[PDB]
Design a protein around this ligand. Structure first.
Ligand SMILES: CCCCCCCCCCCCCCCCC[C@@H](O)O[C@H](CO[C@H](O)CCCCCCCCCCCCCCC)COP(=O)(O)OCC[N+](C)(C)C
Ligand SMILES: CCCCCCCCCCCCCCCCC[C@@H](O)O[C@H](CO[C@H](O)CCCCCCCCCCCCCCC)COP(=O)(O)OCC[N+](C)(C)C
Ligand SMILES: CCCCCCCC/C=C\CCCCCCCC(=O)OC[C@H](COP(=O)(O)OCCN)OC(=O)CCCCCCC/C=C\CCCCCCCC
Ligand SMILES: CCCCCCCC/C=C\CCCCCCCC(=O)O[C@H](COC(=O)CCCCCCC/C=C/CCCCCCCC)COP(=O)(O)OCCN
Ligand SMILES: CCCCCCCCCCCC(=O)SCCNC(=O)CCNC(=O)[C@H](O)C(C)(C)COP(=O)(O)O
Lengths: 84, 88, 55, 104, 178, 124, 128, 274, 175, 459, 70, 63
């Protein structure tokens, strides 16, 4: 059992420099009269689910919302239990 | 590993994909047997950046003594299939 | 008597059994790594007892 | 032999040799598993001077730190029974000088 | 690796090699893609200023200052593909590469397994036997007198012929035998 | 720490050296000079065989802590009180040591001032 | 400008920084051509002796035989007594022996003196 | 001697780790720095604390290398971090396991690395030791935090940089169970063991408030300064490195000289004079 | 056990404390040791009883060899080879016996150091002094004989040592 | 003792009257039986010795060497069985005759109650080895090697004989027992110095000493596999046995006189261990390794302490077994490739895996990995030398490091990497070779269970 | 022993629901444990005992005479 | 079933053998197994003798 499902590649017209910092790179390049020949090639790294990035503190704080809710529930329960 | 056994169709498709993405080449004018220096009018540096794009694409780098004398997508696909021992 | 010695020697002793079976037929099958992993896990849960006794 | 071209189709790929070519007298010293003479980004003399300076500076600074000790502002530890004489060495038939620790 | 080198490297070959190496080391410098693209385009613009220079002395003076500059700024830890001569898996599977003739030493009880494969191998051996005695004469007649001048081999020119010295290049074990 | 700076960069004799402290008699300050008290005896503490370095004036709390640790074994969080008392006794020992250090420092400073005053009187 | 890379015995000059390669001459091109011609005749002979079906043995290598024979059996017949050779041999084969003799003799003399005067504290020294 | 050797080892190894691109190399240098810290702990006459540090270091460093191995397998045996970008969302379980392990290794309150880490710094600060060893230990902790944030930043936050053919997968029970067992260890074993063993040394119950907090402040400074330095990589400016970066990248040039100068001078002699 | 004399290898009475459960939680140690006993100790003990009754079914004895005392090398003629051979064999047997004596004392020291735990430095000074005395005697007897040791060489070493001792005693008396 | 000598003599009739195709089988079976018989001598006493008769006695130093000598002959027969396939039955029978004569001479040498009889047999052992090396040797330099391997010994052996006869005129006896019991100190005089040198140099040259070790690489490289096995395993141990037996009369002059040889051995062990690193030949490399180990044994014998002697005995036995195994592996390579150089035949582990395992085990045991008896002897000698002087530990540690380095170098160059392409005539390892290596290695790991069997009379 | 997941070739890789919830469970558990431990022993991290100021002690408890008695 | 046979063929037989060898061969010789002489703290009683260690010196308890 191996991965034989006949994968098909996407359409090459989908990848556009627009919406990616490569548009800024192109603007800086044209300010000198230059143009990147490989701009559309890499644009997929900015198009799909990788378009949304997360910060360092956000990465460190991966499960604090749920853990904080669990903690507040637990401390409330302990406070209501020991006060008896 | 879990790597799918890539075939000639996949290599050619991916090479043509990278060729189409490049702006300097009109997608409707390229072909499998499309030459680089004369059919398309691309510089030698343009051929070396095409080699760079292929190397980034497939995860291995072609020796320069083999890279400098590759001028068609068909012979490039053939070289890469020979390197990767591809059946069909 | 004082199962500390028996347990603390049995852990290391059973750690060596797959080495004895390395010449057996199971070494020529695909089930040997699972055999070694199960043996080492059993050795760990067996060595947990002398730790409790010391504690 | 490490700096020989890694793309040529040598007759002996690991040793990077051809069949009939002459063999260096010290080949067994250069077998890519031993001392090599491959070019390095930073010059050899600069490397040696930097490493020697770092090692010497660390040694001297450790000596200086040995000269100036870092300690908390507290007296020595005080132990109950004659600085713990009977169970540090023993010798109970000597009756050493008694020590009384200060109350403060 | 497949094609035989030449007696030397021309000026354009040298400049192409430097361009390749410099761009690779710059990519190793600029981890992010946009920064790499910007600086690579700047690099190409700097490079193409002198494409039309015609003085051989000026051409020699060029690319040499470039090489010394490159050696100064070469990113002492460049990025290497895993299977390249500097990679982390350059010769990982050379321990799995066994020769072809080892099958000649298999026990008949082992050769009883896989009979079709060994029949095909027998056909291959007969093909090699005939093609070699053809190729010996073909190369002996084709070679320049006084010895070959370049280590490139001619192809086959008749109908039933095969490329000279073809067995051990066709019959390589694999890239990843196991 | 400030003592390191004030010693290595200031006056050497102004502050003591911890290796040789004390350098003055105990009852030099005041003549009462109470002596430190014991709870653990040699036999019971040798039975304890705590450690040579743990055999200090805070030993009784350590013995009670080890009791609590052995009896209520599965509940390894039962006797948090004895841990607190042992920590407090070590606190007290440390502050008495710090008080001894400050005591020596001010005695040495006072002696240095007295010597300077004696020199000034002799010169006058 | 940039600071110059200085080659050493263990960190040799890079291939692309050699001043010799950039001084090109037709004589140099002929030298490289004949070098590659020699390389190609060697490669052709090796491949001809290599791809033969009949051959079922080691390809004997004249270069390896020359290497081994020069390393092992050619040394003494070409030796000549020279001040350099004699001094180097005497030093490297004689000096270490006397150095170690001096060290060990001094140590054992000190130990024996400490023994005779009785202050060595050999309590529990039972196995020797 | 033990104290000085441990201090110099941990500092040198962290400094070497601070510029490495291969993931296994930086984790190995981190392990070397931790071993140097353990030797410092031995040198300050605290063997039981060193043993406890052994016990917790085993847990969290094993889980770190396990996460690294999962990463390398997912990217077709790619080890350089320059070709690795966003894996925070592309593969989340290894992300959370590595973030927990990095937090633990640096050392945090009520974390397995904390008991070994908090106590070690506490004891070395409260002991008659070398000032230089103290300083190098603090800088080693700073560099530890710095290389932890280096690896996480360059391997999980930026845009992806691997070959477009995506073979990223994790749905394998063996990897998940094996990683989560060590995760549970790295969260609970420190507390359970520290509160389970009998006491074996005098604690540092009294301390100045600033001197108690040195470990946390230095780890936070390492985190912040290294994060701000790596954030400047996005800028569209390129300058040639200094001599310090070259010294740090080539491992203080120790592997160069000492692997070419002695060997040669041995081997040559073994043929010429011998 | 009766297999070894308790006097040659003395042991303290090994007082052990009592269980004082301060909580109502069932400790895992007691249930664990009881299941261990039930699953392991009973079959091994039963097998041992079977083996011991099989042994008692067939009983044989062995006796320790005794050796007669023989004239030593001091009672030996300068060339009479028979007496010298007898004295050499006796001396070698005595050497082995003394080695075993030092073995016994070393075993005592190791056992005391392990048993008394943290208080080894104080609670085993008797064994340390005993080993010091026996080691001093053994060193005096056989320290420097080296390879090819012989009764004559040991006798010469002893004679030189007593010459030194008597000279020192005479000097001290006449000091 | 005749129950071992007589069957060995009867082996000659057994081989010469054997069927033309049954010589190997009969010789192997009866040699193994003789080894089984010789195992009986291992039951030694803590008392004097096993004095069988006025002519032969056994000892816990003689017994392990005797057992090893008896055990080596079947291995030599099995190893030589291969490359003697194209020889006439007469010449194969002559070969086996030389092997039996060598074993008989070694057996009579190791008991040898008298010193002159010991010298006579110890010198008679030279002739069959010389004939084997010079006649059934491959290259043209073998003759030269023989001359070397002869004249060195004779130049060393002649003063000893003179010394021996002189001793009998002064003492009146040369029996070991009377010599030990009537031993008297040697006054520090020039005549006694020359007597000491004459008694010591004959055995010192055969060890070999570092200065006098020229002959060994030539002899090992030129000898056939059986010659290499017998020279590495037993024929080097004759010097150790002789020095151990003869040092009893040399006291107290040994302490002063031993310094030059101690310095030579301590420096030469380092020198030859380093020489091993740069070597293009297997047999030469193993020869230099043997020189290093025997130099350590020389140091042990010269120190003259109980631990020294025990370590020297254990190391002699262990090195004999290990060196014989390593030479067997090298000959297995040669008979396939016909080159005898390390760099040509490479990456053999991919192609011969079980032989790679044998290579690894032999390299580990030559590396002195604990708790093998190699390390037992090494550690005992190291401890004795440390007691002798505390500075020796530096040289011993350097020797250990370089030993590990060259052993793993010899494993790496031959077994790992990529195979040489043009090589194709390498056939899978036969059962004979695998059994040879197994019979080489199993006794070592069995002996490490009972070290006291090989620790000598000072145990 | 997993499920079949195909390569994607320049799209976001396929992601399993079970893995995402589990990764979040363990992270939340870790954070909850840290917070619980902080809450249970707030004083311990801060330190059990206050550090005294040696300059705030009066001369009486330290045994000091006004520079003339001794 | 696999775990059932594994738990007896790989855990139970070894502990049987080792416990037999320890209790009836190793412990037969003196000093082969040496324990720690467990800690004795005030207030405990000893099973062998039955006496009780006297309590401590009633230090002042506060905070
Ligand atoms: C392939 C995968 C593995 C499968 C096999 C698994 C089983 C492994 C078990 C094998 C070794 C593991 C260790 C277990 C050791 C148990 C046996 C050992 O205890 O017995 C030893 C016994 O073995 C022998 O002592 C060692 C054998 C000596 C070898 C002599 C060489 C053989 C002759 C060949 C020719 C000689 C050539 C070299 C000349 C010197 C030591 O006995 P000892 O504790 O003391 O006292 C015995 C009881 N007494 C008191 C009644 C006497
Ligand atoms: C080549 C590889 C190795 C070969 C073998 C080398 C080992 C053999 C070397 C022998 C070592 C020295 C031989 C004699 C040692 C005697 C002790 C001497 O060295 O010390 C001094 C001796 O003084 C002088 O050295 C006298 C000797 C001088 C003449 C000897 C020649 C020295 C160099 C020759 C070496 C060549 C050796 C090989 C020749 C073929 C002490 O002075 P003194 O107290 O008065 O004499 C004590 C001896 N008494 C008691 C008998 C009187
Ligand atoms: C004193 C020790 C002397 C050292 C003996 C040197 C032996 C020389 C022959 C060895 C064989 C050569 C060899 O193995 O190859 C060298 C090999 C290849 O180098 P790589 O970096 O791995 O390159 C791989 C990428 N191409 O490198 C090595 O392993 C050489 C290592 C030699 C180390 C010698 C220097 C060590 C100095 C230590 C001094 C400090 C001691 C510490 C004291 C502690 C105090 C408590
Ligand atoms: C590997 C080859 C090395 C060969 C060995 C070389 C060293 C051996 C020493 C030279 C031969 C000496 C043999 C002596 C035999 C022992 C006899 C003996 O010791 O008796 C002595 C005899 O001693 C001698 O006669 C020694 C004279 C030696 C003459 C020939 C010496 C040969 C050259 C010597 C120089 C080399 C010495 C060291 C070399 C070391 C090895 C190279 C007492 O003589 P008496 O007159 O009977 O006593 C009555 C008065 N008390
Ligand atoms: C991070 C690393 C930094 C390294 C920096 C190195 C410095 C870079 C600056 C280089 C400056 C130059 O251009 S050096 C200029 C060298 N002289 C010439 O280029 C003259 C004629 N040029 C050619 O012939 C070429 O081949 C060409 C036509 C370009 C292509 O040819 P193709 O048509 O066959 O593709």
């Amino acid at each position: 059992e191996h991965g034989h499902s006949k994968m098909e590649l996407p359409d090459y017209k989908q990848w556009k420099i627009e919406g990616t910092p490569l548009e800024t790179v192109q603007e800086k390049l044209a300010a000198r009269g230059l143009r990147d020949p490989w701009g559309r090639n890499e644009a997929w790294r900015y198009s799909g689910g990788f378009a949304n990035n997360v910060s360092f503190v956000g990465a460190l704080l991966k499960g604090f919302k749920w853990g904080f809710a669990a903690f507040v529930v637990a401390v409330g329960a302990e406070y209501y239990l020991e006060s008896q | 590993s879990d790597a799918p056994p890539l075939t000639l169709e996949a290599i050619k498709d991916r090479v043509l994909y990278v060729l189409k993405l490049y702006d300097k080449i009109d997608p409707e004018k390229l072909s499998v047997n499309s030459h680089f220096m004369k059919d398309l009018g691309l510089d030698s540096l343009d051929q070396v950046e095409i080699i760079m794009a292929m190397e980034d694409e497939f995860g291995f780098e072609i020796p320069d003594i083999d890279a400098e004398k590759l001028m068609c997508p068909q012979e490039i696909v053939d070289y890469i299939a020979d390197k990767k021992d591809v059946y069909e | 008597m004082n199962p500390f010695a028996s347990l603390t020697l049995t852990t290391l002793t059973i750690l060596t059994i797959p080495i004895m079976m390395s010449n057996s037929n199971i070494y020529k099958t695909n089930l040997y790594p699972n055999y070694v992993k199960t043996t080492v896990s059993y050795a760990f849960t067996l060595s947990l007892v002398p730790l409790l006794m010391f504690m | 032999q490490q700096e020989r071209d890694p793309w040529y189709d040598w007759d002996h790929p690991d040793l990077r040799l051809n069949w009939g070519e002459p063999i260096h007298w010290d080949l067994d010293m250069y077998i890519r598993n031993r001392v090599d003479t491959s070019p390095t980004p930073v010059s050899w003399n600069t490397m040696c001077k930097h490493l020697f300076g770092f090692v010497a500076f660390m040694l001297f600074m450790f000596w200086v730190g040995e000269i100036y000790p870092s300690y908390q502002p507290v007296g020595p530890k005080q132990y109950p029974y004659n600085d713990l004489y009977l169970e540090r060495g023993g010798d109970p038939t000597k009756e050493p000088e008694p020590v009384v620790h200060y109350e403060i | 690796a497949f094609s035989a080198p030449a007696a030397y490297l021309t000026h354009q070959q040298k400049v192409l090699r430097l361009y390749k190496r410099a761009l690779r080391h710059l990519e190793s410098w600029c981890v992010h893609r946009d920064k790499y693209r910007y600086f690579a385009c700047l690099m190409r613009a700097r490079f193409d200023e002198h494409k039309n220079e015609k003085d051989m002395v000026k051409a020699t003076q060029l690319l040499r200052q470039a090489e010394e500059e490159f050696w100064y700024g070469q990113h002492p830890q460049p990025y290497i593909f895993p299977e390249s001569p500097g990679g982390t898996s350059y010769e990982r599977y050379e321990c799995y590469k066994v020769p072809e003739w080892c099958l000649d030493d298999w026990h008949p009880s082992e050769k009883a397994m896989y009979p079709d494969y060994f029949a095909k191998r027998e056909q291959w051996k007969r093909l090699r036997r005939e093609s070699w005695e053809r190729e010996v004469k073909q190369l002996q007649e084709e070679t320049p007198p006084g010895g070959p001048r370049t280590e490139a081999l001619p192809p086959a020119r008749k109908e039933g012929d095969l490329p000279p010295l073809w067995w051990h290049i066709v019959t390589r074990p694999r890239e990843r035998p196991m | 720490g400030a003592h390191l700076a004030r010693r290595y960069l200031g006056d050497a004799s102004k502050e003591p050296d911890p290796l040789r402290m004390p350098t003055f008699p105990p009852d030099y300050g005041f003549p009462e000079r109470k002596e430190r008290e014991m709870v653990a005896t040699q036999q019971e503490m040798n039975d304890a065989q705590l450690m040579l370095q743990q055999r200090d004036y805070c030993a009784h709390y350590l013995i009670q802590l080890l009791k609590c640790k052995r009896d209520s074994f599965p509940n390894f969080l039962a006797c948090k009180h004895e841990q607190h008392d042992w920590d407090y006794c070590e606190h007290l020992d440390y502050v008495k040591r710090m008080k001894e250090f400050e005591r020596e420092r001010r005695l040495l400073q006072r002696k240095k001032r007295r010597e300077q005053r004696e020199a000034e009187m002799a010169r006058g | 400008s940039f600071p110059k890379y200085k080659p050493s015995r263990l960190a040799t000059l890079p291939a692309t920084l050699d001043p010799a390669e950039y001084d090109i001459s037709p004589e140099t091109r002929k030298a490289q051509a004949e070098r590659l011609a020699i390389r190609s005749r060697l490669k052709r002979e090796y491949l001809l002796q290599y791809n033969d079906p009949n051959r079922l043995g080691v390809i004997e290598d004249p270069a390896l035989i020359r290497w081994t024979y020069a390393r092992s059996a050619n040394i003494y017949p070409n030796f000549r007594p020279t001040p350099k050779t004699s001094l180097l041999g005497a030093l490297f084969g004689i000096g270490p022996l006397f150095f170690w003799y001096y060290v060990f003799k001094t140590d054992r003399d000190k130990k024996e003196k400490l023994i005779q005067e009785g202050k060595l504290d050999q309590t529990f020294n039972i196995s020797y | 001697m033990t104290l000085c050797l441990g201090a110099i080892t941990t500092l040198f190894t962290a400094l070497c780790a601070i510029t490495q691109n291969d993931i296994k190399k930086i984790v190995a240098f981190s392990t070397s720095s931790q071993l140097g810290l353990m030797m410092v702990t031995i040198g300050i006459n605290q063997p039981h604390l060193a043993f406890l540090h052994i016990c917790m270091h085993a847990f969290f460093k094993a889980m770190l290398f396990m996460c690294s191995g999962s990463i390398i397998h997912s990217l077709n045996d790619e080890q350089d971090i320059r070709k690795m970008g966003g894996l925070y969302k592309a593969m989340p379980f290894t992300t959370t396991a590595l973030i927990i392990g990095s937090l633990a290794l640096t050392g945090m309150p009520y974390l397995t690395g904390f008991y070994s880490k908090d106590l070690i710094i506490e004891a070395v600060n409260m002991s008659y030791t070398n000032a230089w060893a103290l300083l190098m230990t603090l800088i080693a902790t700073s560099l530890t935090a710095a290389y932890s944030t280096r690896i996480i930043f360059f391997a999980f936050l930026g845009k992806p940089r691997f070959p477009p053919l995506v073979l990223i997968n994790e749905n394998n029970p063996l990897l998940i169970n094996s990683i989560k067992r060590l995760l549970i260890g790295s969260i609970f074993a420190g507390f359970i063991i520290s509160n389970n063993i009998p006491p074996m040394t005098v604690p540092n119950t009294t301390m100045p408030l600033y001197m108690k907090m040195t470990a946390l402040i230095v780890t936070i400074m390492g985190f912040m300064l290294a994060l701000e330095l790596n954030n400047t990589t996005y800028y569209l400016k390129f300058k040639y490195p200094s001599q310090t970066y070259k010294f740090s990248n080539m491992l203080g040039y120790y592997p160069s000289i000492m692997h070419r100068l002695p060997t040669y001078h041995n081997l040559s002699m073994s043929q010429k004079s011998a | 056990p009766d297999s070894w004399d308790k006097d040659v290898y003395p042991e303290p009475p090994r007082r052990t404390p009592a269980p004082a459960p301060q909580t109502s939680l069932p400790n895992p140690v007691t249930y664990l040791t009881k299941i261990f006993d039930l699953l392991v100790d009973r079959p091994v003990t039963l097998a041992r009883e079977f083996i011991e009754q099989q042994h008692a079914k067939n009983r044989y004895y062995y006796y320790h060899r005794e050796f007669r005392r023989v004239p030593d090398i001091t009672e030996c003629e300068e060339k009479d080879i028979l007496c010298m051979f007898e004295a050499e064999m006796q001396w070698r047997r005595d050497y082995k016996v003394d080695q075993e004596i030092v073995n016994i004392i070393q075993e005592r020291l190791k056992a005391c150091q392990q048993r008394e735990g943290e208080s080894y430095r104080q609670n085993c000074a008797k064994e340390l002094e005993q080993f010091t005395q026996v080691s001093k005697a053994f060193q005096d007897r056989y320290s420097d004989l080296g390879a090819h040791y012989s009764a004559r060489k040991c006798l010469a070493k002893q004679k030189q040592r007593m010459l030194a001792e008597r000279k020192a005693a005479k000097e001290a008396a006449a000091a | 003792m005749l129950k071992i000598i007589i069957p060995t003599t009867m082996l000659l009739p057994m081989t010469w009257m054997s069927k033309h195709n049954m010589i190997w089988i009969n010789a192997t079976v009866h040699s193994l039986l003789i080894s089984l018989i010789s195992l009986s001598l291992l039951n030694q006493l803590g008392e004097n010795s096993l004095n069988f008769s006025l002519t032969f006695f056994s000892d816990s130093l003689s017994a392990p060497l005797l057992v090893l000598t008896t055990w080596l002959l079947p291995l030599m027969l099995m190893a030589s069985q291969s490359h003697l396939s194209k020889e006439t039955t007469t010449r194969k029978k002559l070969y086996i005759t030389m092997l039996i004569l060598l074993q008989l001479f070694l057996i009579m040498t190791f008991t040898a109650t008298e010193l002159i009889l010991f010298y006579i047999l110890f010198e008679a052992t030279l002739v069959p080895t010389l004939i084997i090396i010079t006649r059934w040797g491959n290259q043209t330099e073998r003759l030269n090697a023989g001359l070397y391997f002869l004249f060195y010994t004779l130049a060393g052996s002649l003063p000893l004989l003179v010394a021996l006869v002189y001793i009998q005129n002064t003492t009146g006896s040369l029996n070991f027992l009377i010599i030990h019991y009537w031993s008297h100190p040697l006054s520090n005089s020039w005549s006694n110095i020359f007597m000491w040198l004459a008694c010591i140099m004959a055995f010192m040259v055969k060890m070999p000493l570092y200065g006098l070790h020229l002959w060994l690489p030539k002899a090992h490289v030129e000898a056939p596999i059986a010659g290499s096995m017998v020279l590495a395993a037993v024929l080097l141990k004759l010097g150790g046995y002789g020095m151990m037996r003869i040092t009893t009369i040399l006291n107290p002059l040994t302490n002063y006189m031993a310094y030059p040889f101690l310095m030579l051995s301590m420096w030469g062990m380092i020198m030859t261990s380093s020489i091993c690193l740069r070597q293009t030949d297997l047999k030469s490399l193993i020869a230099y390794s043997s020189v290093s180990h025997m130099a350590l044994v020389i140091v042990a014998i010269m120190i003259q302490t109980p631990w020294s002697f025990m370590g020297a005995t254990a190391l002699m036995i262990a090195h004999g077994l290990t060196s014989s195994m390593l030479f067997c592996l090298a000959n297995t390579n040669y008979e396939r490739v016909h080159s005898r150089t390390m760099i040509l035949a490479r990456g053999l582990q991919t192609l011969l895996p079980l032989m790679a395992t044998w290579w690894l085990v032999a390299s580990l045991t030559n590396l002195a990995l604990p708790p093998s008896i190699n390390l037992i002897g090494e550690l005992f000698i190291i401890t004795a030398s440390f007691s002798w002087s505390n500075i020796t530990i530096i040289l011993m540690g350097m020797n250990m490091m370089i030993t590990a380095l060259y052993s793993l170098y010899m494993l790496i160059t031959t077994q790992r990497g990529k195979y040489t392409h043009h090589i194709n005539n390498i056939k899978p390892s036969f059962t004979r070779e695998n059994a040879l290596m197994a019979l080489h290695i199993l006794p070592l790991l069995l002996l490490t269970l009972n070290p006291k069997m090989i620790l000598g009379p000072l145990y | 022993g997993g499920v079949h997941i195909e390569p994607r070739y320049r799209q976001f890789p396929q992601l399993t629901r079970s893995q995402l919830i589990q990764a979040e469970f363990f992270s939340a558990t870790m954070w909850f444990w840290i917070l619980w431990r902080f809450w249970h022993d707030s004083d311990a991290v801060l330190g059990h005992f206050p550090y005294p100021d040696p300059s705030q002690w009066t001369d009486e408890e330290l045994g000091i005479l006004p520079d003339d008695e001794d | 079933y696999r775990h059932s046979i594994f738990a007896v063929t790989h855990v139970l037989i070894p502990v049987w053998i080792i416990h037999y060898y320890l209790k009836y061969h190793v412990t037969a010789k003196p000093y082969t197994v040496v324990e720690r002489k467990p800690r004795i703290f005030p207030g405990d009683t000893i099973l062998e003798t039955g006496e009780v260690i006297p309590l401590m010196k009633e230090f002042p308890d506060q905070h």
